């Protein structure tokens, strides 16, 4: 029993050391990768939601059609979104309307990378290569 008491003391010290090492290793691991873990968790949840507006804006931002300022909520507020392609323009822009964030905006002003105001007439399949992409569309909620 004298020997068994020392065996148990050593065993208990070993268990304490194992627990402390596990806590330290996992804490440093969890702190090390927090930005990447948080972003991946964000997008996992954001896909789990499966909303129409969030999916639309995310799928557009993947192609390069990102908004240059916070999407406004109040009616008749100004949104500036960059459009990088004629296909992205065609899918979203119809006539002088603009389908974005599962809402219909009214185009006010289309400018180019040259900062020269262009009109919706010039934006055509045949004429599309002439325009200096990416366009910037300034529109108002409707």
């Amino acid at each position: 029993d004298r020997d068994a008491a020392m065996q148990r003391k050593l065993e208990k010290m070993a268990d304490q050391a194992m627990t402390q090492m596990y806590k330290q290793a996992r804490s440093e691991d969890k702190r090390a990768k927090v930005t990447s873990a948080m972003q991946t968790m964000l997008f996992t949840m954001l896909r789990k939601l499966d909303n129409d507006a969030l999916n639309n804006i995310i799928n557009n931002a993947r192609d390069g059609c990102v908004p240059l300022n916070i999407i406004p909520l109040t009616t008749a507020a100004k949104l500036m979104v960059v459009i990088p392609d004629y296909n992205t323009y065609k899918n979203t822009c119809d006539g002088t309307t603009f389908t974005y964030a599962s809402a219909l905006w009214e185009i006010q002003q289309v400018v180019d990378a040259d900062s020269k105001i262009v009109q919706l007439s010039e934006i055509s399949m045949d004429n599309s290569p002439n325009l200096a992409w990416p366009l910037i569309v300034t529109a108002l909620r409707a």
């Binding site: 065993e11 208990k12 070993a14 268990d15 194992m18 627990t19 596990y22 806590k23 290793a25 996992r26 804490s27 969890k30 702190r31 927090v34 968790m41 949840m45």
Partner: protein, 662 residues
């Protein structure tokens, strides 16, 4: 007025002799001449009105240029309280050579040096007086959002929680704040108007409130008997730049701690207190701010008050339930001592809107004087007055450093001083007793049928407005009346009353409307009746005390009151941790063990979705332990030899936490 003018004794006397000419009691403009603690209240209550006709730049510390080893310091050698008048330090050394640790600490704590050195400030964000700006650029402090614990939320939603239309829905989140949080929350001191409390009634509410505090004992203690709870807590400003409170409780011997304490008993030490933003889970988006007081103040206030303050927290069955646990059948004992034989019980609970930012200066001084009636032997009278002056200079109305800038605190209790729960308890009992006095006097008098209560009202008016000396016989009689018909239970601002219903309906004891009136004319806040509750059936306890609802369950062979929390609170505490290492889970099983200990009573709730929270926590603890063993068996080849976590996912361990045996 002359900018340099700070002594308005002649003006105060002229005002008193012009308006309150025939008021026959004496009036000492400088409260330092007062005969006792019932003459400090009177003269301070006059000063709190006469000080609203004098410039606001004239108050605060009175600096003076001294010389230390030939170099000129500017140090505060007094104070000019709006209530206590001009107070002068008794130990001023105009020519010193060496600065010991005590003197260095004193000269670094007080705001004279910092304010004089720093820039001038003009802050248009707040209406409160702004003294100085220490840095060259103002600092804006934000509050980060909570860290989501996705594993637990996924487990919960897989256990059928958070469904649409459930009765247990998340309501407690970690709210974030922009850079205008600290100064838009310090700005709520604008609700603290200069209130001139009725004096012939306050000087009787004081006697009754003191009777409430008669079971206790207190006094001064040596520096070697003060026990600090946690020594790693911050040390205020400017001491937080060089260490925590441990550094200053170790660097200073006991001899030079008693030296500082005995220095404060005949001197005033103005002090700066930071305003720290609180990062904690809450149900409303307003920022929560706490006043971090310096160490030069906390050390001495502990040495002064701690004997009484730890005698309050070691007495069971009294009005002030502080130090009484809600475990091991403590909640039942509290709720059954509240029902101390009141004839037709009805439970009541009020709420103080902006309790710590609207509390008038007169009543905070009253609380500080009621807590200091235990120094009848240890302290002389000047010692007690200078201790009161130190409390007022460091807590009540002192410089507040809100993001790299010193403003002036108009008043109201700072919620981080050495005596915050107990001072507020004294306040709460004061308001309750004032409500009772108003309700009893304002009653008609010819409609009162009980011939004893009619004579009691008669003698109450006589003892208020026709006597100048206490009438201890009648004070005892009224105190017995209150404890027979108005049993109270007070925790630091939160009260449950078991008032007699027949008397309250007749008007012989305070009701909700009486409390609303008393708060209107002694706090300058309107107590809406939509936040104060009344319970007509004792078989289901107070509706809400200390944020814990109460329910009568069956244990063994008898019935007991169990406190259960808000299920949303426990769920939001599990889901939203305030750190990234508490999100791991397997590291923190004690977190969930404690949360399950808190949420156990829900199992006995009739609402099944409420009772499911405890089992959710038990199942999550079981899963956490299982995956912890898996991870520790992969990180090694041998699992823990003696893993005694098998008892944390059985309800018996928690079931034993609400049983009276231990």
């Amino acid at each position: 007025w002359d900018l340099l003018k700070y002594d308005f004794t002649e003006e105060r006397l002229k005002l008193f002799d012009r308006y309150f000419k025939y008021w026959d009691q004496t009036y000492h403009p400088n409260c330092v001449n007062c005969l006792d603690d019932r003459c400090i209240l009177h003269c301070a209550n006059f000063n709190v009105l006469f000080s609203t006709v004098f410039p606001p730049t004239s108050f605060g510390p009175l600096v003076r240029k001294i010389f230390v080893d030939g170099v000129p310091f500017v140090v505060s050698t007094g104070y000019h309280f709006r209530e206590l008048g001009v107070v002068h330090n008794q130990d001023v050394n105009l020519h010193s050579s060496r600065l010991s640790f005590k003197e260095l600490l004193v000269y670094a704590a007080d705001p004279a040096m910092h304010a004089a050195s720093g820039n001038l400030l003009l802050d248009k964000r707040t209406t409160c007086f702004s003294v100085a700006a220490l840095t060259n650029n103002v600092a804006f402090q934000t509050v980060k959002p909570g860290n989501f614990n996705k594993d637990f939320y996924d487990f919960a939603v897989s256990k059928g929680f958070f469904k649409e239309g459930s009765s247990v829905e998340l309501k407690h989140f970690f709210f974030a704040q922009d850079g205008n949080a600290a100064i838009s929350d310090y700005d709520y001191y604008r609700y603290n108007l200069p209130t001139m409390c009725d004096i012939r009634q306050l000087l009787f509410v004081v006697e009754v409130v003191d009777k409430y505090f008669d079971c206790y004992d207190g006094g001064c203690i040596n520096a070697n008997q003060v026990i600090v709870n946690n020594l790693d807590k911050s040390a205020g400003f400017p001491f937080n730049k060089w260490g925590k409170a441990r550094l200053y409780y170790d660097s200073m011997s006991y001899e030079d701690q008693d030296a500082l304490f005995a220095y404060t008993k005949r001197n005033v030490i103005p002090t700066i207190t930071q305003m720290n933003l609180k990062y904690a889970i809450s149900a409303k988006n307003r920022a929560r701010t706490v006043a971090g007081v310096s160490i030069c103040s906390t050390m001495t206030n502990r040495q002064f008050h701690q004997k009484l303050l730890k005698s309050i927290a070691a007495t069971r069955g009294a009005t002030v339930v502080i130090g009484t646990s809600k475990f091991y059948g403590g909640w039942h004992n509290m709720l059954k001592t509240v029902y101390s034989d009141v004839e037709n019980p009805h439970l009541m609970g009020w709420d103080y809107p902006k309790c710590d930012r609207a509390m008038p200066n007169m009543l905070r001084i009253m609380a500080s004087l009621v807590l200091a009636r235990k120094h009848t032997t240890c302290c002389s009278l000047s010692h007690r007055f200078y201790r009161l002056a130190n409390e007022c200079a460091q807590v009540l109305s002192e410089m507040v450093m809100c993001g790299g800038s010193l403003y002036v605190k108009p008043g109201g209790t700072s919620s981080g001083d050495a005596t915050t729960a107990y001072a507020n308890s004294v306040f709460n009992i004061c308001q309750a007793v004032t409500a009772n006095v108003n309700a009893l006097l304002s009653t008609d008098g010819n409609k009162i049928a009980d011939k004893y209560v009619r004579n009691l009202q008669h003698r109450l008016y006589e003892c208020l407005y026709r006597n100048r000396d206490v009438d201890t016989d009648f004070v005892n009689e009224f105190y017995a009346y209150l404890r027979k018909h108005f049993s109270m239970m007070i925790l630091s601002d939160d009260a449950v009353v078991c008032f007699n219903s027949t008397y309250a309906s007749q008007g012989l004891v305070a009701s909700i409307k009486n409390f609303k009136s008393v708060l209107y004319y002694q706090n300058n806040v309107f107590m809406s009746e939509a936040k104060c509750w009344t319970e007509t059936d004792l078989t289901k306890g107070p509706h809400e005390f200390c944020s814990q609802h109460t329910m009568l369950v069956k244990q063994g062979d008898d019935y007991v009151y169990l406190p259960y929390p808000d299920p949303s609170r426990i769920l939001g505490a599990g889901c939203f941790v305030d750190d990234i290492v508490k999100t791991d889970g397997t590291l923190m099983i004690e977190r969930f063990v404690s949360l399950a200990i808190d949420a156990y009573p829900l199992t006995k709730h009739p609402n099944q979705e409420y009772a499911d929270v405890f089992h959710l926590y038990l199942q999550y603890i079981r899963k956490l332990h299982d995956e912890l063993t898996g991870h520790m068996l992969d990180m090694y080849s041998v699992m823990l030899t003696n893993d005694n976590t098998s008892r944390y996912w059985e309800p018996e361990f928690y079931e034993a936490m609400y049983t009276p045996h231990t």
